[PDB]
Design a protein around this ligand. Structure first.
Ligand SMILES: *[C@@H]1O[C@H](CO)[C@@H](O)[C@H](O)[C@H]1NC(C)=O
Ligand SMILES: *[C@@H]1O[C@H](CO)[C@@H](O)[C@H](O)[C@H]1NC(C)=O
Ligand SMILES: *[C@@H]1O[C@H](CO)[C@@H](O)[C@H](O)[C@H]1NC(C)=O
Ligand SMILES: *[C@@H]1O[C@H](CO)[C@@H](O)[C@H](O)[C@H]1NC(C)=O
Ligand SMILES: *[C@@H]1O[C@H](CO)[C@@H](O)[C@H](O)[C@H]1NC(C)=O
Ligand SMILES: *[C@@H]1O[C@H](CO)[C@@H](O)[C@H](O)[C@H]1NC(C)=O
Ligand SMILES: *[C@@H]1O[C@H](CO)[C@@H](O)[C@H](O)[C@H]1NC(C)=O
Ligand SMILES: *[C@@H]1O[C@H](CO)[C@@H](O)[C@H](O)[C@H]1NC(C)=O
Ligand SMILES: *[C@@H]1O[C@H](CO)[C@@H](O)[C@H](O)[C@H]1NC(C)=O
Ligand SMILES: *[C@@H]1O[C@H](CO)[C@@H](O)[C@H](O)[C@H]1NC(C)=O
Ligand SMILES: *[C@@H]1O[C@H](CO)[C@@H](O)[C@H](O)[C@H]1NC(C)=O
Ligand SMILES: *[C@@H]1O[C@H](CO)[C@@H](O)[C@H](O)[C@H]1NC(C)=O
Lengths: 478, 481, 482
């Protein structure tokens, strides 16, 4: 919490809010894998069409078989899903996510079936994008990623002359798409039908259609530029027909809300100069604060904006008692690893002010023409208008115009290395010292046990002396 | 053999696969014709983009070409018909077993590669994206040209002073786009580039829309082109090159897998658990190989995975510690738990119809017997089969449970809080510094302690003396009487 | 300096390369026309795509523009001609050196930027993939349109109400593919988007089929277009942008390389060895920098590598521990080995004709001199040169050794078993917990040995007291008797 933690060299670089998922707006798409070629054909065969159909069908066999095993067999069983999830054993061993996704799958069964009910019209229609319609109502959108390119190249008629050439252009168009499909449909998981469709997969699958579909299916105020460039869009396969080669995907757009009393701070670190060496604090690069509570929170899998971080689920990791204390101001509990600093990690601008390691890097001020030096008592030296106005950090001059407002104590036992190999070597060293301490103990024990025995002899002598003084005292005393 | 009943700790076997080794392999030769054929007549015009493309690509292939020449037409076959053993390997400088292996293969494919480049003229004259290279009614391999179909599509029937500007432009963006991708594969960084493996990813860039056709046409295997294209099975290596004709000969190889008996590759996932008053997660390898009583960490990140099989070139196993083995072998007092920030996605798992959840860290609201499932401290994880709940609700997710478990909680769980620690470097280093600090005090305390000891030795020599004199003084006083 | 007698340990030098520092960098400007030119006449027809593409590419470039403004158009130049001062940096909020460095370079190029962004119309109205930007017999750089050629092939000579739907479809997919790729480069995540660098990856997406042409045209160095495109030497930054004309001015920068006199960058590979009865591997860094007697880990993950050279903008070196340095310098008693599961691929190496192999873990069968090479426990690795074997066979691999080794240099290999341990975090923590348990017992046992020490000192104090009385009587009975 105490950002006064930048005396050490760790500077906050961002403060975003945390958004969670409340509900989701959806849309159904039918990916038409086989394009429409309705021009008459005689005395000629277009082999590429056959091959594409065969290779793609085999490629989709796992998704299909999984779909049947789950859907068309153990959950909706020759009847109509009424809301009770049954036979989840069908999934074998599944994660919470997969189980969640399976339920969503059966819940979508009725819509997927409505759309697949029109598979035939969808196939006969030549179109890159098209509204799947049933008597005055839109079920969703039907897309075919290669249709436009195909229409540009197909001959109005395919005769025995055209043949060779046509089978070639259609061939390369289909095969290129096929190849990209190969990139997305690999049979490795047990329930592939339940794997999420990423925006990258959607791009491959929908080709040049993605933009059009993105707008056509969502009415939110969010622009098509955001949906495409961010990672909010995510979909899942909800239906398949291998004969018409049509895949029904359900796309989803999250409805993000902000979680109160929670911030997600980014921490960067410049090299400090402590106890005679260039070092760098060792802390998480992204933390989450909720009052006094602090967790590590890298949103590598979340969508990040300049002022917000939207995450599917919580990815927080617990920090160590020593780490927290260090973030909460207590700098004697931090940890610094030595480093080979460079220009890029020796300084940083922070709202006009510049924080830098002037001990490791030459902070040669120009206007005041005075070379800045750094007290061995200060890890990092600040630099505002007061200390300079036109500073020059090796090959880079620039003015300074702001002013910064506002006890140090660092033990060299805080300067360690956090590297497996390095740690194991120190561990070995510590262990050898424990072994020396144990030997010292043995030596020590042996000696004390020897004194105890001499003490015994000494007592046996005191007695005899004592008794001898009692007798000699019987020739003059009682 | 790994009590899978290590599930009481929250680790669940999510997969069991067979391991497969690569006995032999089938291969085929491909000639990548880098220069498109253009037959439409040219007159009163000069397509320059073709000149540039030729120049840039020839440079980009100089390193591979030079290397290929040095090894081949220079030192390994020694420009003398190979015999059976390789000679002159010092030519490679420093090489790894994988590279030497490839070098040996290079010279072995020497004969075939020659046969193919021997037809570089015909191969180049022929306009075709894919064509069979033939000699004496035999097929030596396949000839591909990734852009041909596209070029053919755009190039006009006759190029003339009128077209020139527009034709050169389209033929240019086409060749240039290919060039860019190609420039993404051939970067000279190593000392022996001609020996670097060609991946399916590079193979795709190199062959373009031609890949599916080639894959099908090169092997007859039962495996489908879909498996071949979508798996990582296929691999290739350069074994021929003619910079003049810009034709690169490549040898593609498809393995012939075999099931190594008595071996399984198990995937291990962990849900969080509640132990000694904290939400923790067991720390173990995520993928182990098992053979008898031997367990090794087997991260097959370099292999081809199937729902039932794992196949690798060479095993990438890692040895596990005695404690970690003890743990997976069933001795839970040896496992290691790290505290974690649980979430819905990590507090339960479905295992063949029965659920396994951390009902302390999560609200397991049973719906049928309408009760809140309470998790006793002596259970880091609860099991929920039909007998405990026929209708369960887990945070907005409701489902039925109609399968019965098989009681094996015969032995109570013995777990010490010392098993709960962080396995993260930073955290480990801090702990080590604490340990060391504690030991340094002891080492100091022993040094001072070593002083109160030197004092005793003294007060003892004093006593032994005063005693020696008191004895003389007594016998003296005694002899006087 | 670095006994390669580190080879007796199975760690071998695979590459020695020179290091190179980036001195000066010759630049060049590029104007990216994000909108193609359709000159053919249009009648009664709305090419819908041109509108949509435009609305989208624009909201996409808003962040880069908005930010690029608050910086250039509002807080560094300030409605006036720059004068080498750089004020108002506070506008960047918190910014790193690389960013600040860029903000400087931005305002510095502002002049050339606006110059180009002043020939908008000439650029827009012109129809070409690659167009030289000129102003009074001078090249201000190059203007480029990634999709132009393609569009020209497609676009009909005259777009009518009959061609419409058809044309809007072809043109529309061409633009949308490009738009999609652009959606891959321009996500708004940072605070100063405009400052983020442009990679050859981003560059490729942006200029498409143009890149090879632009590159060769705007640089006259000895480096071939091939290398500039294959390596990672090229970089650029967004200097000028105009949302209305959809033109982005970019500054491509090609670095001038300068060798660091003494430094050398060595790559270390390790084969398994057989030490204290088990197969293991030495735990050293993979790439190190060596200058005289200083050694640092040098992972040039970013840098541009060549068979003989390594060029980086700034260092990425890491400090090595004393034990690691001692090991790298020949003191093998300080190295660290980890038991491993060996494989063919990691059991041997060819070093200038001579093979180095673990012949305990692998069967080193000599073919010509016909014999099986045995490796004594004392040799963690064996060296097979021509003197030992002419034709060797390492299962399936059969080759000839024609070189001789002379590195017969002798030095006793002293290796303690405490050098064989795991470097895996989980394993380290398990070991640290055991060391802790001992430290724990030692401390309790110490508590006790502190109790005796007091009790011993107690009976001593007593003895020394009884020796008082006994001493007075003997001095009394000595006088009261004379
Ligand atoms: C068309 O050609 C394909 C092979 O290219 C063949 O399998 C098919 O039988 C031919 N057409 C039919 C259905 O007869
Ligand atoms: C795919 O080929 C099969 C024959 O194997 C045929 O029944 C089916 O209609 C084809 N699908 C399409 C959409 O062409
Ligand atoms: C900061 O650490 C020191 C010792 O490491 C401790 O004495 C102090 O109490 C800690 N911070 C506070 C005041 O809680
Ligand atoms: C510590 O040293 C002893 C012998 O000196 C050894 O048995 C132990 O393995 C070493 N360290 C550990 C616990 O790894
Ligand atoms: C054809 O164009 C190339 C460059 O594009 C040029 O080098 C050559 O001179 C031209 N034709 C000739 C031989 O004049
Ligand atoms: C590529 O250019 C070279 C010389 O510039 C020429 O010899 C060669 O014929 C061209 N490509 C081919 C093999 O047609
Ligand atoms: C498990 O480990 C304990 C100590 O960690 C050991 O005493 C016990 O024998 C092991 N389990 C059994 C009974 O094999
Ligand atoms: C252990 O602590 C001692 C003093 O407390 C210190 O000298 C030593 O460097 C520490 N261990 C290591 C080598 O990190
Ligand atoms: C073309 O269509 C778009 C939307 O479909 C519309 O906004 C635009 O006004 C139309 N063309 C023009 C500029 O009139
Ligand atoms: C982009 O759209 C704007 C208005 O929507 C228009 O002024 C501009 O001409 C379009 N792009 C260009 C520069 O052609
Ligand atoms: C190598 O290490 C040993 C102990 O591990 C040490 O005694 C020796 O001095 C070191 N090498 C030399 C001779 O510097
Ligand atoms: C060492 O053991 C003691 C108790 O057995 C414990 O308090 C300490 O935390 C353990 N090691 C460390 C410093 O983590």
């Amino acid at each position: 919490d105490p950002a006064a933690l930048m005396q050490i060299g760790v500077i906050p670089t961002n403060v975003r809010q945390l958004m969670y998922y409340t509900e989701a707006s959806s849309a159904f798409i039918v990916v038409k894998l086989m394009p429409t070629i309705d021009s008459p054909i005689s005395g000629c065969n277009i082999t590429s069409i056959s091959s594409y159909n065969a290779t793609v069908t085999k490629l989709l066999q796992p998704i299909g078989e999984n779909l049947e095993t789950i859907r068309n067999q153990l959950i909706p069983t020759r009847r109509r899903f009424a809301g009770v999830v049954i036979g989840l054993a069908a999934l074998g061993v599944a994660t919470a996510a997969q189980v969640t996704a399976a339920v969503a799958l059966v819940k979508a069964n009725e819509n997927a079936a409505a759309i697949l009910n029109l598979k035939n019209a969808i196939q006969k229609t030549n179109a890159a994008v098209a509204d799947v319609v049933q008597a005055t109502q839109s079920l969703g959108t039907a897309v075919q990623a290669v249709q436009d390119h195909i229409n540009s190249v197909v001959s109005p008629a395919i005769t025995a002359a055209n043949c060779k050439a046509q089978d070639a252009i259609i061939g390369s168009i289909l095969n290129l798409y096929l190849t990209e499909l190969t990139t997305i449909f690999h049979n490795q998981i047990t329930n592939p039908a339940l794997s999420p469709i990423t925006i990258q997969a959607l791009r491959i699958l929908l080709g040049s259609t993605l933009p059009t579909v993105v707008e056509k299916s969502f009415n939110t105020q969010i622009s098509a530029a955001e949906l495409l460039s961010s990672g909010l869009l995510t979909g899942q396969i909800v239906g398949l027909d291998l004969t018409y080669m049509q895949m029904v995907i359900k796309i989803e757009l999250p409805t993000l809300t902000v979680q109160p009393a929670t911030q997600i701070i980014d921490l960067a670190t410049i090299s400090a100069f402590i106890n005679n060496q260039e070092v760098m604090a060792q802390l998480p690069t992204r933390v989450m604060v909720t009052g006094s509570l602090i967790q590590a929170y890298p949103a590598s899998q979340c969508t990040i904006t300049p002022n917000t971080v939207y995450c599917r689920y919580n990815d927080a990791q617990v920090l160590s008692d020593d780490t927290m204390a260090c973030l909460q101001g207590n700098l004697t509990r931090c940890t610094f690893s030595p480093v080979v600093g460079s220009f890029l990690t020796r300084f940083v601008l922070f709202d006009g002010i510049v924080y830098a390691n002037c001990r490791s890097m030459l902070c040669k001020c120009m206007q005041p023409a005075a070379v800045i030096l750094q007290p061995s008592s200060s890890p990092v030296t600040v630099i505002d208008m007061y200390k300079c106005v036109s500073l020059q950090l090796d090959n880079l001059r620039f003015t300074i115009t702001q002013l910064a407002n506002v006890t140090i104590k660092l033990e060299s036992s805080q300067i360690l290395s956090i590297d497996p190999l390095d740690i194991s070597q120190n561990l070995a060293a510590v262990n050898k010292s424990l072994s020396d301490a144990l030997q010292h103990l043995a030596q020590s024990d042996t000696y004390l046990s020897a004194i105890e025995d001499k003490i015994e002899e000494i007592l046996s002598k005191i007695y005899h002396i004592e008794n001898e003084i009692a007798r000699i005292k019987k020739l003059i005393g009682e």
